[PDB]
Amino acid sequence: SLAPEDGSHRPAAEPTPPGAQPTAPGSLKAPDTRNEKLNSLEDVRKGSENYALTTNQGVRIADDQNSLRAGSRGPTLLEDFILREKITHFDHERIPERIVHARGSAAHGYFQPYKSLSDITKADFLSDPNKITPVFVRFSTVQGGAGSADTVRDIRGFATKFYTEEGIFDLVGNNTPIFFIQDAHKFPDFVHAVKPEPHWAIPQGQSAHDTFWDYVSLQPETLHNVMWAMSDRGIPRSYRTMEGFGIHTFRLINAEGKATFVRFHWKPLAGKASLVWDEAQKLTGRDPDFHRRELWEAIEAGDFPEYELGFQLIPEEDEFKFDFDLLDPTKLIPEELVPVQRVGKMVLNRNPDNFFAENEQAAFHPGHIVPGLDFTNDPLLQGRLYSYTDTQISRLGGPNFHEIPINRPTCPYHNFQRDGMHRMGIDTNPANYEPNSINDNWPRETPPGPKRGGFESYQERVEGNKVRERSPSFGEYYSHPRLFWLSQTPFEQRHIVDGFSFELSKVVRPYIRERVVDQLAHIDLTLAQAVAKNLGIELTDDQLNITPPPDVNGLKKDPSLSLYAIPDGDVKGRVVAILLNDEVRSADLLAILKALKAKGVHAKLLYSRMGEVTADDGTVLPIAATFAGAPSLTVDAVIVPCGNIADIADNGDANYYLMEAYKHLKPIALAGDARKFKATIKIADQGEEGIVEADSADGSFMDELLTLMAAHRVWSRIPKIDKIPA
Amino acid sequence: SLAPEDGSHRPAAEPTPPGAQPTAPGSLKAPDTRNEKLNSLEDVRKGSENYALTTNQGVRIADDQNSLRAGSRGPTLLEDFILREKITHFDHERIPERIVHARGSAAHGYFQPYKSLSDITKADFLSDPNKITPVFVRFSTVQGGAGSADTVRDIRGFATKFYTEEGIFDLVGNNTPIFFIQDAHKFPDFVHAVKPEPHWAIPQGQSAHDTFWDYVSLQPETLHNVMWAMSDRGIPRSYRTMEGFGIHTFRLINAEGKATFVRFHWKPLAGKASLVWDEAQKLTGRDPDFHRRELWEAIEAGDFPEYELGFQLIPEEDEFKFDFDLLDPTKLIPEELVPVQRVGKMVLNRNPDNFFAENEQAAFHPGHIVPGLDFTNDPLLQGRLYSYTDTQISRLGGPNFHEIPINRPTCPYHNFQRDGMHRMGIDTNPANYEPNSINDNWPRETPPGPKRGGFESYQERVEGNKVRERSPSFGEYYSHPRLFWLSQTPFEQRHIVDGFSFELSKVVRPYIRERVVDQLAHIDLTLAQAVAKNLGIELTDDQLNITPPPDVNGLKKDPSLSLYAIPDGDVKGRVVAILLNDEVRSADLLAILKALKAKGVHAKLLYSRMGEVTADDGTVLPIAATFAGAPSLTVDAVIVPCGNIADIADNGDANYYLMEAYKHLKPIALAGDARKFKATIKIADQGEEGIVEADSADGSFMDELLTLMAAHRVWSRIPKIDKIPA
Amino acid sequence: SLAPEDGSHRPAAEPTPPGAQPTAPGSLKAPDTRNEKLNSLEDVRKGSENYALTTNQGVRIADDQNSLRAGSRGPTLLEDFILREKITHFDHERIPERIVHARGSAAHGYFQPYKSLSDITKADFLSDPNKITPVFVRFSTVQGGAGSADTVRDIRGFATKFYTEEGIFDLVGNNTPIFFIQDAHKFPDFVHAVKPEPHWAIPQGQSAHDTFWDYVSLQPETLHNVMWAMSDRGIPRSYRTMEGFGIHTFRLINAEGKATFVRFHWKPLAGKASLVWDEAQKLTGRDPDFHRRELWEAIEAGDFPEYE
Amino acid sequence: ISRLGGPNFHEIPINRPTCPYHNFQRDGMHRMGIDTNPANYEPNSINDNWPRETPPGPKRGGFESYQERVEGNKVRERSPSFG
Ligand code: HEM
Ligand code: HEM
Numbered sequence A, B: 001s002l003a004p005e006d007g008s009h010r011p012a013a014e015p016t017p018p019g020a021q022p023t024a025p026g027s028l029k030a031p032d033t034r035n036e037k038l039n040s041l042e043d044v045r046k047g048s049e050n051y052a053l054t055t056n057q058g059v060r061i062a063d064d065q066n067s068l069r070a071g072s073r074g075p076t077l078l079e080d081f082i083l084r085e086k087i088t089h090f091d092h093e094r095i096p097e098r099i100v101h102a103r104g105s106a107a108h109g110y111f112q113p114y115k116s117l118s119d120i121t122k123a124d125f126l127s128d129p130n131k132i133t134p135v136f137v138r139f140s141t142v143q144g145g146a147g148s149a150d151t152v153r154d155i156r157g158f159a160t161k162f163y164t165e166e167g168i169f170d171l172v173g174n175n176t177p178i179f180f181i182q183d184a185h186k187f188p189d190f191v192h193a194v195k196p197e198p199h200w201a202i203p204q205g206q207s208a209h210d211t212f213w214d215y216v217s218l219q220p221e222t223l224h225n226v227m228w229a230m231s232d233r234g235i236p237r238s239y240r241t242m243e244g245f246g247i248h249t250f251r252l253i254n255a256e257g258k259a260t261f262v263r264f265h266w267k268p269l270a271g272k273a274s275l276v277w278d279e280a281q282k283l284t285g286r287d288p289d290f291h292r293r294e295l296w297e298a299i300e301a302g303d304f305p306e307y308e309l310g311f312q313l314i315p316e317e318d319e320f321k322f323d324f325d326l327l328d329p330t331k332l333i334p335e336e337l338v339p340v341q342r343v344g345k346m347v348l349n350r351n352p353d354n355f356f357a358e359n360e361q362a363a364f365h366p367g368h369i370v371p372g373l374d375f376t377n378d379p380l381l382q383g384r385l386y387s388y389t390d391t392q393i394s395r396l397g398g399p400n401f402h403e404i405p406i407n408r409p410t411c412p413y414h415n416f417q418r419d420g421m422h423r424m425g426i427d428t429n430p431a432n433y434e435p436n437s438i439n440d441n442w443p444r445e446t447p448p449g450p451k452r453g454g455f456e457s458y459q460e461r462v463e464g465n466k467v468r469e470r471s472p473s474f475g476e477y478y479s480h481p482r483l484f485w486l487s488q489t490p491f492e493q494r495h496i497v498d499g500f501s502f503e504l505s506k507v508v509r510p511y512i513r514e515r516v517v518d519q520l521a522h523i524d525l526t527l528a529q530a531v532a533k534n535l536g537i538e539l540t541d542d543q544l545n546i547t548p549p550p551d552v553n554g555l556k557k558d559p560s561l562s563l564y565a566i567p568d569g570d571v572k573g574r575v576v577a578i579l580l581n582d583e584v585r586s587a588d589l590l591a592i593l594k595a596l597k598a599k600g601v602h603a604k605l606l607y608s609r610m611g612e613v614t615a616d617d618g619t620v621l622p623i624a625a626t627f628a629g630a631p632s633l634t635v636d637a638v639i640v641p642c643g644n645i646a647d648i649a650d651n652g653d654a655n656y657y658l659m660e661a662y663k664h665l666k667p668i669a670l671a672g673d674a675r676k677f678k679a680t681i682k683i684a685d686q687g688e689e690g691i692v693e694a695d696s697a698d699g700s701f702m703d704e705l706l707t708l709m710a711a712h713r714v715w716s717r718i719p720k721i722d723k724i725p726a
Numbered sequence C: 001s002l003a004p005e006d007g008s009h010r011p012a013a014e015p016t017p018p019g020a021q022p023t024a025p026g027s028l029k030a031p032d033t034r035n036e037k038l039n040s041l042e043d044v045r046k047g048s049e050n051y052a053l054t055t056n057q058g059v060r061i062a063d064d065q066n067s068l069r070a071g072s073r074g075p076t077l078l079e080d081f082i083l084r085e086k087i088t089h090f091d092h093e094r095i096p097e098r099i100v101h102a103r104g105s106a107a108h109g110y111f112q113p114y115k116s117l118s119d120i121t122k123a124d125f126l127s128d129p130n131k132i133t134p135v136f137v138r139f140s141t142v143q144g145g146a147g148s149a150d151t152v153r154d155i156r157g158f159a160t161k162f163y164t165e166e167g168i169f170d171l172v173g174n175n176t177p178i179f180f181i182q183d184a185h186k187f188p189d190f191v192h193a194v195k196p197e198p199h200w201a202i203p204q205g206q207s208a209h210d211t212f213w214d215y216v217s218l219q220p221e222t223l224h225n226v227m228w229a230m231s232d233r234g235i236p237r238s239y240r241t242m243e244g245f246g247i248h249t250f251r252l253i254n255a256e257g258k259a260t261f262v263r264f265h266w267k268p269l270a271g272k273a274s275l276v277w278d279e280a281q282k283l284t285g286r287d288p289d290f291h292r293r294e295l296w297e298a299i300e301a302g303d304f305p306e307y308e
Numbered sequence D: 001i002s003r004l005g006g007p008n009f010h011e012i013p014i015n016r017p018t019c020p021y022h023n024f025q026r027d028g029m030h031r032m033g034i035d036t037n038p039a040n041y042e043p044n045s046i047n048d049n050w051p052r053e054t055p056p057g058p059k060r061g062g063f064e065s066y067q068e069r070v071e072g073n074k075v076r077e078r079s080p081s082f083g
């Protein structure tokens, strides 16, 4: 039952493009990629080659194919301890998934700051540009279970665990800069409304159902993050191509004791990019693991996810200087008013070895801060501080979840806590309490100070009566959705209209749709009217006369809110499909592959069957996938070289591949006789912006395609796609 | 610094006698003691001296005395993550106790065979007299909770984990050679009957209640082990002075495939010794931790518990040679018929560092066997095989309880099991199934063989129908109880009678007592009449005429069944109380301590207050405890030196000390005017056997006392003790 | 039939003095003692007389004495679903004990006010003397495990659950009027110092050990409750003869919104009474269930524990 | 047991039998039924041995396994008839 004689079962332990080798555990794929956290996990890494199969008690197994029975056709016997331990472990494999963010994908990496930030914070991980901090990052969706699809419309989580010399700091953020609700007390109501409805547990991974829109229509504080979710921000192309945000205002505390308010940002160095709805939704069917796969394969290829940490900083004396409350997590701070200061870079450069042990069991919690940081009274942040530790208790089995290897600090940890389920650490301290004399009071408290000090809270003044009451300053719900709307390009606005229209069409109770449209009329009447037209709703005279909400501190738009208004495209790590024929013109394929290689763009060679085809010069070309098996959904652009085009000219899958790519706004390039495919996408002979065509592939043809790919999608084609049957 | 300036907070890291120093974690008390398992635990041992106090995430704490509040008389705030982590861990410290044997005391040690047993077993741990195998041993009671008392009347558990090079072997035995029941189906019934009654949860630690004796009276198979429990075997002096037994017949399998039946024995090298019932019972009140303390203090003193492993071996062809079924766990194999062959020595030489992490979390299970051993169809053993894996699941939190450090093998273990709560090992195998080609099928099965082979079951023939039926050969209940009863000394018989008499007097429903007396009359009429007289019950003419059961294979006694018939007294590690007065004669004390020291016997110097006293010659004498503080129950003998005897002659506690010791059959030695105490225990002037007396405490005064100690207790005193008001 | 012909296996369902009859579940000893909470539990009470022995799935069992085997001296078979269920249930009977107060004894009863307290509180259970509120009360020690002894020297817990028409109110108190420490951040340190020491898990049920006195010596705020514990308050004669206190100042709030500060007390109508030390210590050996037994038997006798 | 939290999963409403169920099993996490039987073991006399075993019969009888003949040696072996 062995491996093939040629060694082809084992992936090369070097960087390789997606599809070139089977994927593997990180420590086998990239054994030389190290950091202090990855090294610390070596105590618990288990090999396998050359080892005997055993029970968990170390007894070697002779026959792992059969249960013990009284005769070979007889009953199974109770005394088969080998069968019993294997089946017992299997029967207890599953642990509860996370209440929210159950679907997620993670990797290891490292961070380092660009310069010391000691004038604004004493946090050790930001004190020295040459001090590197290992990280572990998990990206997630919010609503769906751990077996749900990746490219759903949803907010995404972006959680980073920094293993610092002064403790673990978890920055537990999302990919939009606000949340849906203002006070943690409402979190279970909001989550219950977006999650599958309770009688039948439908729908998975979707906010397109009555209960979500019922809640939104009755809680207008949700409308800002709803706008984000209905835009193409809700359907990122990759976890590499979305922004992150801590949402809450936190504090930085320097060695002099000065507090500065801060909001955290991650900027993707691969740039911002999103799918379009129909593409996203079909990809949940054709590849429900698309983002998990893309992240893993980018790290294997050396296309490491990179992100810049950024801080918006506000001095303490400017707390009340905006027209919204800084402590309101439904409000963003526009970068036109407070710029994001660049702070450091994070690089994700190694995949885990075992998804369950490292990803599934990782525990992130925003209460895990370090000296030099502090909280604020944001009432959503305040309630989060209760929930992360308590949940990690039923999910991970007990109070020792910090001893699960992925969660362990790499700095020292010593205290008087003892026992609890699955206790690993064996304490030798004669004392388990303090103050004690019997161990000379060790381990000891440490006064706060500029470095290596004990944690002390910032001594914020508190004055008020004990109340359950929302601050009046939080009761403004429409100005930030309007600012967002007006900062989007015209095509992004169209996609927001379509996202609300699609979702509310799936709400069965028509009055809920009408109440959402009335909320939209309080944001922008153009938006309201465009959604109402798709729902066959007519706005009333009163609704047409609602006064628009005020500008946000004088702003009419802020272009940093748009994905696309400011070009930021980076083609390295993108992928093109190359549709082969049985006699490819090898000069075209040479020119194509050379130009893609120079820009770090990968190729996938597709055909109508698997195996190999031979080019005109004898080059044998292995086929990555069939046209049906790896649809246009999964690539960024499509190139069709010349050769024997008659082999594929009448193939329905090949023609549909181009039609889907065209409808989804992807760049298409056709060389030579492949130009006959222009006819299937039912447009021009003089050509069209977005379709690169030439007698042969070459420097100029590839340059033009690569420039298209740098702009991500061909937005100009939008009006030509409603007629295409695809 | 809170430690005293003179360093007297820290115990000496060297062997010291009981009470000389405070006790400590084993690796701090005996850092030079090692073995392969202790060395492998080093990676999870945590120190304390010189480290900062932190959260579990490694953040240094500055103030561990106060919660975060809004003003120093204000409400506590939810953002106090340091308080929250500390209270959350504490809130979750407890795990379920074991269903039975919840009260237990454990130690590390090692085992070595005296010679290779390869002719009868291929078990690696028995293959070489130079091969030393680490062990971890837990002794326990059965019925009471983890917080119940040590010196109850009960069966004791004796469980040994051997960390072999071919797997963990757990020998999970008790301190009697049979069990109460024949088939595992009845275990919940028996245990429910012995355990506190379900309406009110009384009594703890005791079988002296209606439900236990109701079950016994209805299930005469229980009578053999009940006889053992009612004897002084139910009240051992120490875990170091009891026997252990595997109970079941197992098999040894050699390299040629030959099976030999085997029953396992532990022989205590300190000899056999037990308390008397009134002493045991009072000790549960004065020191409920007396056996746990004694085991720990013996190891800290260097009085290491030592046991010889022995095998009773029966050839396969002798399966049916006895009057009873070898597979019946209510029958013993008399050592007159099959002698115990010595196999090796186990020495327990290190205490744990942390009781919870190493004792509470240890998991022993008799299904953990290694190549060279195998099971038999004993129907109690068969059912045990189901129970120990399952229970260790709710108890220890999941299917990865072998990764808890004390449970881990020291030999390699590799397999395709994955996940489960609290998974520590991070598997790098590309495959999690076999057969596989992707990892060339590793880890791989191993054929059985003479050494280092895979486990294969012995191919025993099975023939019969699927039935729920007890074998007729098991249906004999009285002959082994009678052999036991006949093998006892007269004083041991008297204690058995008194054990039954006391227990049945606590049974509230009189017919249950009557039904039990009827079962006794099927064993031995003398026994049944003596118990009946104590209960005011008169035997009928029919009961007086029940034919005794037959002898066992012609035996009418076997002295190996008695604790005391064949003297095996060791005094090393025993303890003597020395009662001081305010002006002790130093020449007496010097003599006493010198002789005790030469024989390895400990002393505790007692008085009517703490502090010190001064001898006649000015020597300062440190007092260990007061008369009331360390009662006679806790020592093996009592010595009173001369001096100012009028200081203590009318001290009620000093008098009571001697009466208690006397009642409990302990040797008592009186020097000089300490002979005035004869009147308080009613001793005549010619003296009496068991009271050592003289003008001073030498020539042969110490030799006579140490001779009485070697014989444990003064049995011949028993007729005199009923008069003494104590 | 295994019961004796004369029926002396079954205690009479009428009050009887301690030792006169075997003790029995409450609903069999006193079937006509009722309150709203005891009546609401009727849906989950299960009987036994005249019913067949079954699996948990309702399958009747024919032989509850033997495992299924291949021949009557053969190996046990994995298809024995009856054995498997019965052993699986037994293997999971235990749950974690309480972190503190693990040893306790409980009874049902009821509470009634002497007068309407509406001028000081709007709490509905205090609003009318004819309003009866069921209670369930658990008394406990603090340090020992659930199988430790009753007459140790310790603080005792006195916890009452009031099943009111406006919600459950739990009054979770002890038998002395203060506690050992000031701020909850220190609770795990104090409890760890009083509990059995971590290396060897001794001593059970006792504060007479180095780490407790270490902490006391270093934390003089403890000294007041230590005084109480070393007095005979630390060794009550019975749960019926000790006082109870909520310890903390709470607030009462009336219908006008006025707050009054309040501390809560329970006064034993049987009076206050304690053991002496040598008697208490010896009793932990002769009857470690002494307090649990005394409470049960007092109720079976009609000597109901009463507290104001 | 691990999925549903303990050995009393039969008392979760959807899993409950609609016929009678009585036995001597007790306790476990999440125990809903409050047993009033003085006995939690059998054989017992203190409750006249109830609940009681029921012999097999044509209707409403105790379960008994069919007495199939077993013959062979203790082996980990796939029957050749399955190959
Ligand atoms: C700004 C608003 C919030 C953001 C950005 C946020 C972000 C996230 C992210 C990214 C995760 C997944 C961490 C991972 O990958 O494992 C998560 C999990 C969780 N969140 Fe939050 N969340 C927010 C609000 C809240 C609120 C208000 C609560 C409850 C009061 C909460 C309770 C949870 C819980 C229960 C989990 C599961 C944690 C676990 O099992 O380990 N979240 N959150
Ligand atoms: C010969 C008869 C038996 C002997 C000598 C025996 C011995 C022991 C001993 C010494 C322990 C304590 C191990 C330790 O110190 O942790 C124990 C625990 C246990 N026994 Fe047995 N026992 C016997 C029969 C049974 C049977 C028939 C069953 C169930 C079918 C059973 C179920 C258990 C369970 C559930 C535990 C607690 C295990 C744990 O939580 O780790 N015992 N037994």
Ligand code: HEM
Pocket (backbone or CB within 6 Å): B087, B091, C097, C098, C099, C100, C101, C104, C138, C139, C140, C156, C157, C158, C159, C172, C173, C174, C178, C179, C183, C184, C187, C246, C247, C248
């Ligand atoms: C005046 C001070 C306190 C008193 C009077 C008090 C009283 C009690 C009582 C009577 C019980 C047992 C309830 C029962 O019978 O089930 C109990 C249990 C408990 N107490 Fe407190 N206690 C106090 C302080 C604390 C503090 C400061 C903490 C933690 C910060 C705490 C945590 C606990 C916990 C964890 C249990 C176990 C509860 C359970 O498992 O159900 N106690 N306490």
